[PDB]
Amino acid sequence: KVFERCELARTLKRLGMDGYRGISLANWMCLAKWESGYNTRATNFNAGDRSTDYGIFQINSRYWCNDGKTPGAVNACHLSCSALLQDNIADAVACAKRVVRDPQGIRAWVAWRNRCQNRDVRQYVQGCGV
Ligand SMILES: [Cl-]
Ligand SMILES: [Cl-]
Ligand code: NA
Numbered sequence: 001k002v003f004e005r006c007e008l009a010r011t012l013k014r015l016g017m018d019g020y021r022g023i024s025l026a027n028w029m030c031l032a033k034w035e036s037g038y039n040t041r042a043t044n045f046n047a048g049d050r051s052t053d054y055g056i057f058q059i060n061s062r063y064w065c066n067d068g069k070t071p072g073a074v075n076a077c078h079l080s081c082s083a084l085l086q087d088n089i090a091d092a093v094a095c096a097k098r099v100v101r102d103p104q105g106i107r108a109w110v111a112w113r114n115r116c117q118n119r120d121v122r123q124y125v126q127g128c129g130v
Pocket of ligand 2 (some may be wrong): 066
């Protein structure tokens, strides 16, 4: 499913992402935008280390979910990576919450540092009623 901006913003708020571990809703929106373009079925194979990024938040199979083909991988979210390809993003949000519970926080995603960190991210939630 390809979410529309405000539709996603309202959904994330209801799932309790606003201010989770100090991360504002607009930062989560900026992250989803640059990671998948708000697309839940997005997958990206990384030929370099044989891991794959799954879903709206492009969560990596080496640490967070299990796809069985990634070498030396763990499954911290204790989910099948298939769970992160659903239209319903409940499981993806629960795993994202797990990711930021680690010391790096939102910085775990390099794309966040490149396209969101230290920028005016207000535009991602403007007019959405959140
Ligand atoms: Cl699962
Ligand atoms: Cl599994
Ligand atoms: Na894994």
